[PDB]
Each structure stands twice: as structure tokens, then as C-alpha cells.
Amino acid sequence: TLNPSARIMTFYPTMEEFRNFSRYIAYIESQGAHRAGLAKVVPPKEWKPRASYDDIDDLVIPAPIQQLVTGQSGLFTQYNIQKKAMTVREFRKIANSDKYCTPRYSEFEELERKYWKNLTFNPPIYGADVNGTLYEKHVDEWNIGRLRTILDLVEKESGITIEGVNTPYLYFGMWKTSFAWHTEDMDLYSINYLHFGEPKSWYSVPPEHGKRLERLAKGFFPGSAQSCEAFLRHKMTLISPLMLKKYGIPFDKVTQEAGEFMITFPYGYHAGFNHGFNCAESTNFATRRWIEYGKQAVLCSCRKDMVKISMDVFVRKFQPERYKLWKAGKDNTVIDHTLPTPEAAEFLK
């Protein structure tokens, strides 16, 4: 009953609700936000993660990537070519240059049409996956560098750092730069804050319909699926909404504006593109509900360096009564994507 349309919801927390992060996530899930697989959270007007973004021109983007895209009829494959390092000011000059700047347009639908029509032309540069944060160290609310969720158990118990997952990543985008369809590593949650600049548009498939998308993708790229079952985790696959609609895959879209947060939920597939020069900060996080997803996540093993997280510490601590069975490989739990996370019980009475 809580958002049975499974559409993307937007929330407006007061400063008081905003202070406790994991508690608010539990709240929006009690409101059915997780069903769409993506949700927007507009922070209270008083809140600000940083006083000014005018002192970062010398920040270096170590490995910018040029996005070469090949495809047709709504199905594409993206090849990220690493380019020489450059500073933000240099990236900005190129981003706003006449060659890569956002084309003129009226409504969003028009820009979206131009994106899908020209994505294989004039390959843009994306300052993606950059180690770092732009938050001021005194910001305690929704600080992406320290969210305080159970995902912290990984670093606290194994002392293992997985950059981008338990640490923040910055993304400097320009017109037409894209992020392919995927769910988070280990099917975790993700938080994405657009610090400044032009918008970032998103597409999302309800977690309860995720398999349908995987099925559809496997059909479009049989060779890729043959080489790796979780090939989508390679983050190279682009699929247009027209193709999603044509094959009956449910989905929704939303545009994130500067100063707004986007939360992706476990096993929630998403993809998108940047409208123009901008900067976003992202990382992963977890809740008790994620644990079962982590245990059942289909992983990529055809490549080195892929993110892998042992679920042993979570099962042992949060599901001690199921731990022995699980180790024996006999845990047959079935995930119900509609159910909110346990921490939400508080808001359901």
C-alpha cells in the first residue's frame, strides 16, 4: 500500500529529522521509498555541507575518462578511455567550452531526446570516481565521509578500506557524460549529493522487477552474459527508456538538482546522465535489511579488483541464529523487496 505505484518519492526532512541519518532512511522506507529503488531527499534550507566551492580549482582529477559509446536501436556499450590528469579549472573550461557545453533546449524531455540521439557522438570527458570529499569536517549531518551505518563494520573489524564503497568518491561531469545501468556493489545502498552545477537525471527500475531487467539485458548481450553472469557490474551497458518501455520493464525517471540528495536502495537498478558541468559526491552504506541482499548478491569474478565483501561478520552479528545454517550453505531465505528495514518498525505503529 506504501507507494504501490513504485514511483520515485521525494522527501523534505526538517533539521530535527535530518540529524539522524540511518533513522531517516528507516523512515522513508516506512513510507515505501525503497520500492522505486531510488528516492530524492531535499535537505532543510539551513543545512550546507560547505561554505563555498570557489577554492577547488587546483583539485586534481587523476584519471579522467573519455566515454566512447557504440550501439544502435537503444542498446549501447560504453568504453571508458583514461586520459591525462587535469585540474578542475581545466575540466571546467572544457565542460563549458562550445564543443562540449549543453545544447540549447526548452523542456527536459527535449534534452533527454538529444542525449539518446547524440550519445555515440562527440565523446565527452567524465571526471569520475575521484578519491575525496568536499564536505567541511565540522558537518555532522549526512556527512558522506562518515554516515555511521552498519557498513562501518567492514573497516572496524577487518580494517579493510574499499575506496568508493566505505570512502567518498567525487564525480565532475559535463554534458552527455553517463553512468550505465547497475546496482551498487554487493547490492548495497548508495547516497549521492550534487554539490553544485547543472542537473543529473536518473532512471530507476523497482528492485522487485530487477530480474526482468537482467533477463532483458542478458538477451541483448548474450556474449557478455556468457562470459560473466553479472556483466552489468562492468558498468558498460546503456539501455534507453524507449527500449525499457518496449519490453515491458517498469521504470521511472527523476532529475536531481544542485543541493539535493539521491538515495539508491539494495538491488535497485539505475542509470543516468549529466546535463552539464557539475560535481557530485557518492559512497555506499547499509542497513539491517541489506544483509540478506549482500548474502544473495550475484558477483562478478571475471575481473580483478572487483568489490567483494565477506558477509560473515554481518550474519554472525545480526543473524546468529541463522549463522550455522548459512555457513553450511543451507540458508534458503527469500527476499521480499517490498518490506521496509526492521529499524522502521518504530514509525509503523
Partner: peptide, 12 residues
């Protein structure tokens, strides 16, 4: 090892 890796995808 059981836990490790990096979020950044392999580039070309």
C-alpha cells in the same frame, strides 16, 4: 582475500 577491491571500474 574475502573482502577487498575498489569501486572504480577498469578503464581502457
Amino acid at each position: 582475500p574475502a573482502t577487498g577491491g575498489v569501486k572504480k571500474p577498469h578503464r581502457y
